[PDB]
């Protein structure tokens, strides 16, 4: 996250770190045994780390649970990033508490102008590299479809939305991928792609979760 703030330990209780020897992506806990992330975060050997603040220090609220299965969206296209969403099932249910909690799926899609919370352990610099140990946060509005398409000609599908600031300076970044965009207490986005980080006229692009609620629910119901 570039241009954000330190969230505070366990203040984003649905945020998970996906670990394969190191943090490589975010995700969102949506019930005791399932995480939503980005399809472009797929790999084998995933351990889900819940209850994290500093990802390099055991601070006492962590739960580390291996994935038992991963399900990339049927229609994911890795060239266009259309349908950039993946479900991960945990081998055992997480113990839910104030510090480790699921985030509700949306009942309705969110509108441009809605303020959301984006979070992750990604790079905090738009030029160069500095990766934080503790979770960072950014408050950002959803942008109109028109301005999203103007920023990225030929690239925005009905399964994507932009959020952030056209003036630059505030955005998600490398290592935030797969993490949450939460608006009014519902998971409306997944950190997906952009152009650099925090550049003028290049807002972040996010997977539009409301389009996937039926798929998520029916996948969970049979897996
Ligand atoms: N929001 C931006 N700029 N992103 C998404 C996360 C990876 C780097 C590109
Ligand atoms: Ca930790």
Curated annotation (Swiss-Prot):
GO biological process terms on file: digestion; proteolysis
Disulphide bridges, residue numbers: 7-137, 25-41, 109-210, 116-183, 148-162, 173-197
Residues noted as binding Ca(2+) in the record, renumbered to the chain: 52, 54, 57, 62
Subcellular location per the Swiss-Prot or TrEMBL entry: Secreted, Extracellular space
E.C. designation(s): 3.4.21.4
Keyword Calcium annotated: yes
Regulation: Is inhibited by scorpion cyclotide trypsin inhibitor TopI1.
Free-text comment on the cofactor: Binds 1 Ca(2+) ion per subunit.
Residue span(s) of domain Peptidase S1: 1-221
Molecular function GO terms recorded: endopeptidase activity; metal ion binding; serine-type endopeptidase activity; serpin family protein binding
Subunit structure, interactors included: Interacts with SERPINA1.
Protein name: Serine protease 1
Organism: Bos taurus
Gene: PRSS1
